[PDB]
Amino acid sequence: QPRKKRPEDFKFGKILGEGSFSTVVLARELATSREYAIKILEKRHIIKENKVPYVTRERDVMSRLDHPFFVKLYFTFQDDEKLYFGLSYAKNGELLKYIRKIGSFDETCTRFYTAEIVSALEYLHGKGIIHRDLKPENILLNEDMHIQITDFGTAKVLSNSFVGTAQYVSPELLTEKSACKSSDLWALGCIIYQLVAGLPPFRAGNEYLIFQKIIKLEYDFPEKFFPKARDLVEKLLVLDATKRLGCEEMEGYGPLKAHPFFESVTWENLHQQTPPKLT
Amino acid sequence: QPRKKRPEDFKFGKILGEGSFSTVVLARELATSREYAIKILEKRHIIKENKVPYVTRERDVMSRLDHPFFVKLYFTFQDDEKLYFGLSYAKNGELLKYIRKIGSFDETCTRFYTAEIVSALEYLHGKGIIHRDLKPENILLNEDMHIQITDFGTAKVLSNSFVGTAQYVSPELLTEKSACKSSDLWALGCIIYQLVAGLPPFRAGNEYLIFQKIIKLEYDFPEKFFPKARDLVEKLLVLDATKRLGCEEMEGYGPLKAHPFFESVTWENLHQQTPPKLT
Ligand SMILES: NC(=O)c1nn(CC2CCNCC2)c2c1CCc1cnc(N=C3C=CCC=C3)nc1-2
Ligand SMILES: NC(=O)c1nn(CC2CCNCC2)c2c1CCc1cnc(N=C3C=CCC=C3)nc1-2
């Protein structure tokens, strides 16, 4: 291994994000000029808040990922007070930013980015890992406009407890306190809807009211919604977790990737394809 | 760590190179579509030829390198017969190919590529590692036309034995059977000469005759040779290894990088600069 890095090996720059248990700062490694997104965590605060298992799991999951559509963990170190995780820097920020910038994605762009997300999930679920907080805020865009999925703090490694962002919460988490690969597939359905409609499907004044719409499958499609994309969403936003397209009970990613909405997709080498320009 | 890769995780393609103890093949990882240059070594042949220390050292050195101007080792595995080293793939091949293609480099191109090599050597020598076989054949170009230095089989980790390619052999290897950081600096002088002149400085009908010219410092500069580049070469091709610019006895890379030939170079972020077009 290269000798352990230290804070003094980097020139730290702007803060990219501030979480409850961490801060992500852009850093330039002096010896190389390379930019990393360095996630910084305070050991005392992690201990106080009983987050050792979560931080441990985050590091362990990221160490297992080796795929172009995921954030890469390059190095870790620590000083007396802090843990530092050296991550890939995705220069273009949140997918959510582009949804808002252009309002909604046309069909070509919806297809391409949905295909990248499905392909990332196939990889992740193949490793028996579930994300549990998938949303446009956690799906970043690199300099080449390919996705990089981030935020593995709340991931689960398959062998209750955590519920992610309200708008993307699957009904089984609300009704049975239980998560599975299918919870990510529900979130995928919500994300596809958001790409096409410009907004997530379940929206209300507060969390309780959102949860109420989720468990009743209370959402509708706007008129212009790409018909094949609507059919795919209807196959993902299914209350029964065992009937969601892509899940093991529905025989996996084969049938999901075979959906008519993806007819023109070449699944083999998405990361080497040029992304369509966002309007 | 990601679970160990296997040959069946890759579609192997063309042979990029065939050495005495290894073959490098271009491979595409099925799960990711990523291309790697996979160096393949036959355990039986390595054992027969007493190369275990060299292969061991090669792996150990590459594992220590984390710099944009060096080949990266991404993974290793083995089957019953073979060792596999997953390396970065430099798509544009040997620097030597461009020297031959354009005949010789203009001053701007000579400066930029010499600066990348010096910056790579500063990194490498800072880790107490010496290359010992530096030449345009071992300096590759990536897709963005930045260098990637390869071939660490014959490297030495500082704490006799090996002499590299005849034309780049330093006089102390011939006279004292001894290597040091300064042997790489001699090779750098030969490479700069080759960039500007189109041919290496010491040339003869056979190895003996080459070695004879090296120990007598028998070479000359063609008329048009960039004056400041000539001055730099004269400071590197010095028979006394302790008087070569860049060596510890001459106070290191500071004075080398300060040479007038590099006046307009920004040393900080060469890998993020756009390389000058080769004529
Ligand atoms: N929580 C994280 O792991 C994380 N948080 N950020 C910062 C923002 C990302 C989008 N949502 C709010 C937090 C990162 C990461 C992973 C590693 C990572 C890599 N690159 C970026 N890039 C950004 C570029 C522009 C704006 C924000 C982030 N960001 C991160
Ligand atoms: N010996 C090695 O380690 C090695 N050999 N090659 C193949 C040729 C390189 C130039 N000299 C003859 C052997 C490689 C490597 C490192 C890893 C490596 C990475 N990328 C390339 N790329 C090439 C592209 C076009 C032609 C040849 C090589 N090559 C290699």
UniProtKB/Swiss-Prot annotation, chains A, B:
Any one GO molecular-function label of the UniProt entry: 3-phosphoinositide-dependent protein kinase activity
Q: What controls how active this protein is?
A: Homodimerization regulates its activity by maintaining the kinase in an autoinhibitory conformation. The 14-3-3 protein YWHAQ acts as a negative regulator by association with the residues surrounding the Ser-161 residue. STRAP positively regulates its activity by enhancing its autophosphorylation and by stimulating its dissociation from YWHAQ. SMAD2, SMAD3, SMAD4 and SMAD7 also positively regulate its activity by stimulating its dissociation from YWHAQ.
Q: Which residues form the Protein kinase domain?
A: 10-262
> Which residues lie within the region annotated PIF-pocket?
41-85
Root EC class: transferase
Q: Which key words are in the record?
A: Acetylation, Activator, ATP-binding, Cell junction, Cell membrane, Cytoplasm, Kinase, Membrane, Nucleotide-binding, Nucleus, Phosphoprotein, Serine/threonine-protein kinase, Transcription, Transcription regulation, Transferase, Ubl conjugation
Active-site positions, per UniProt?
Answer: D133
List where in the cell it is found: Cytoplasm; Nucleus; Cell membrane; Cell junction, Focal adhesion
According to its UniProt record, the EC number is 2.7.11.1
Induction conditions = Stimulated by insulin, and the oxidants hydrogen peroxide and peroxovanadate.
Positions binding ATP in this chain are S20, F21, S22, K39, S88, Y89, A90, E94, E137, D151
Give the N6-acetyllysine positions (modified residues): K224
The role this protein plays is: Serine/threonine kinase which acts as a master kinase, phosphorylating and activating a subgroup of the AGC family of protein kinases. Its targets include: protein kinase B (PKB/AKT1, PKB/AKT2, PKB/AKT3), p70 ribosomal protein S6 kinase (RPS6KB1), p90 ribosomal protein S6 kinase (RPS6KA1, RPS6KA2 and RPS6KA3), cyclic AMP-dependent protein kinase (PRKACA), protein kinase C (PRKCD and PRKCZ), serum and glucocorticoid-inducible kinase (SGK1, SGK2 and SGK3), p21-activated kinase-1 (PAK1), TSSK3, protein kinase PKN (PKN1 and PKN2).
Q: What is this protein called?
A: 3-phosphoinositide-dependent protein kinase 1
Lineage in the entry?
Eukaryota, Metazoa, Chordata, Craniata, Vertebrata
